[PDB]
C-alpha cells in the first residue's frame, strides 16, 4: 500500500510560456496554484510548477487547522506544520528524489506571516483586518513542471497521468473582464505617523536588546475584474524568480517575490536572505555605479551580516553538526525596480528531520523581522497598525520525496473582496535615517503600484 | 571524555558557537543557564565549559556566575561577551557603558598573542554585539588584558594562574577573522 515507485510522467510540447498557457484555464479554481520563475535570467530561475484539484486541503485560522478530504473534515489545535507532516505521511506516497522533478506532488501553498504566532508567544496589538488563512495548503498527487534549463514540460501523476492530461487539455480559458483599479492607492500611515513609528524603533534599538526591526507600511485600493490579467502584466514587468499566483477560497495572492526563503534539495539546505536595496538608475553606466555602491556600502553590509548571523543560528540549531557554511556574502542582484544585496547560507538536513521541521525552526524569515527575532516581532506588532497576514510569509512546496522550496512574500499583493493590498518595509538599525527609509519603501513597490493604475 | 558544556544564556547566536565547535570536531552539550545545577555539571564531567553571550546581566544569567566560582582552577572556562563580563565580575571586576554601543559592527582589535590569540594575526577584525565593557581601572590583578579595541576598551582577559579566559566580541560571527582557530586554541590547548 506504501507507494515507493516514481510517478508516471508524460512530456508535453516545449513552449517558454507553457505554465501561463496551461494555468490560464485553471486560474479561477480555488486551490489552483502557480509557482513561476518570472522568466528571470537568474541562478535560481529554472522551474514553473502548476497544481489544482487537491486530494486534501489544510486551512489554519489562529489556533484551528481544518483538514478536508473528499468526504471527511477534521479540526485540530495541533502545531499546523506537525498536522501538515502527518497529512503528507498518511498519503503513503514516498518517491526517491529526482533533480529534474523537485516537486513530485505533496503540499503547496501559503504560510502567512501570522502563522508565526503558533511557534512564538506574541502580543496582539496590530489589527486583524484581512480574513485570509494563516496556512492555506493543498495536497496534490500530480503536477505540471516547466523546466527552463532542459526546455521540458513534464506532467507527473501518482494516479492516472493520461486522464490528468485529458483533464488539462479539456479545460478552456474563458473570456474574463480585464483588471482595473477603481480607486487610488492609500497608505495605512501618513509620513508623520511613519516618522513617529521610526523614532519609537530607534528608541528600542538605542536601549539594546534590539539590533534591527523591519518596519512596513501597507497600500490599499479597490479593484474589479480578473486578478489573473493583473498577474500576467506584473509577472512580465517584475521578472522575479520566486513569483506565484494562488487562487484560494477567500481570494487571490499575486507574488512577484525575488527572495528564496529555504530550499531543501536532496537534504542540502540553502537560504538567501535579501538585505540591502538601492533604486535602479535609467543611465546604464550610473546604474553600474549604484551596483558597486550597494556592494561596498558599510551600512547595508552590517544590516545583511546581522541577518546572515541570525539565519546561521536558526538553521544551525537543527542542521547536521558541522554542516553550516556561507559560500556567498554581499552579492548584488539587479531587478527592474531595485538592486538587492543577497547572501547565501547552506547546511545539511539531518536524516531524523523533515523539511517541515526546518520551516518551523526558521519561520518567519529573519530578513523581514529583525534581530533578536522575537523582540523584533513584538515591536512590529506594537507599531504596524494591521497584521501582515500573507505579506512577509512564505509560498512554496513540500514534496512527497522530502524536498522543499519557499519564498519570502515580499513584493506580494493580496486581492480579497474587491480590495487589493501591497506592503513595503525595510530594516531599521541605529544608523538608519527617517526620510531615506520612508523613501526606500516606495522605491521597492512604486513600479508595482503604478503598473496597476491602468 | 572530551565533552564541552556550552551554557546557553539565551543569545540570538548561541547555536553559531555550537556549530563552530562541531566544525572543530568537539562533542558539545548545550544547556540553558536555568536547566542545569552545579550537581548536574559534576555528574556530566565536562572536560571544559563555555559561557555564552546573552541579553541579561551576569546576576540574571542563571548558574553562569556559580559555574565560574565553583570550576575556576578546576576546568578550563571560556566566557563570550556576557560570559567574559561574568568572569570579570566574579573576581571583583566592574562592567560599565562602552564609548559607542556596537550591534553587528566590525572593529580591528590588537592583541598580545596570548591565550586564545596564540598564533593568530594582529590586528584581528571582529564582530561586536554589546553596550557594556569591563572597566579597565577596577580589573582584578589576577587578569591580563589580552586584547584592546582602537579606543582602548577591553576585548579579552586571561586569568594569570588558571585556564579561564574571556572575549568581549563574537568569534563565531561569519565576519570575525580566525574565529575557528581562536576557538581551536581553547579546544586543543
Ligand atoms: N525559482 C524556483 C521555483 C519557484 C518559482 N516561484 C516559486 C515560489 C516559491 C518557491 C519556489 C518557486 C526554481 O527554479 O526551482
Ligand atoms: Cl499554539
Ligand atoms: Cl488602510
Ligand atoms: Cl532591504
Ligand atoms: Cl519590501
Ligand atoms: Cl597592554
Ligand atoms: Mg537598508
Ligand atoms: Mg517522518
Numbering used by the authors:
A (entry chain DDD): 0 to 453
B (entry chain AAA): -1 to 187
Passage from the reporting paper:
Here, we chose aminodeoxychorismate synthase (ADCS) from Escherichia coli, which consists of a class I glutaminase subunit (PabA) and a synthase subunit (PabB), to investigate the mechanism of glutaminase catalysis regulation and its impact on overall GAT activity. PabB catalyzes the amination of chorismate (Cho) to 4-amino-4-deoxy-chorismate, which is a committed step in folic acid biosynthesis. GATs comprise minimally a glutaminase that produces ammonia, which reacts with a synthase-bound substrate to yield specific nitrogen-containing products. As evidenced by analytical gel filtration and isothermal titration calorimetry (ITC) data, the PabA and PabB subunits form a heterodimeric assembly with a dissociation constant KD = 0.16 ± 0.06 μM.
When the crystallization buffer was incubated with EDTA, in the resulting X-ray structure, the density assigned to Zn2+ also disappeared. Comparison of the glutaminase active site geometry in the presence and absence of Zn2+ allowed to identify conformational changes associated with Zn2+ binding. While we did not detect any significant positional changes for the catalytic triad residues aC79, aH168, and aE170, the side chain of aH128 flips from an orientation blocking the PabA active site in the presence of Zn2+ to a conformation, in which it integrates into an interaction network forming the glutaminase active site in a catalytically competent conformation, in the absence of Zn2+. Finally, in all ADCS complex structures without Zn2+, we found a second well-defined and structurally conserved water molecule in the glutaminase active site. It is located approximately midway between the imidazole side-chain groups of aH128 and aH168, suggesting that it critically contributes to the establishment of a catalytically competent conformation of the ADCS glutaminase active site. The associated changes are most visibly illustrated by a long-range movement of residue bE119 from the PabB subunit, which is 10−13 Å from any PabA residues in different ADCS structures devoid of Gln-TE in the glutaminase active site.
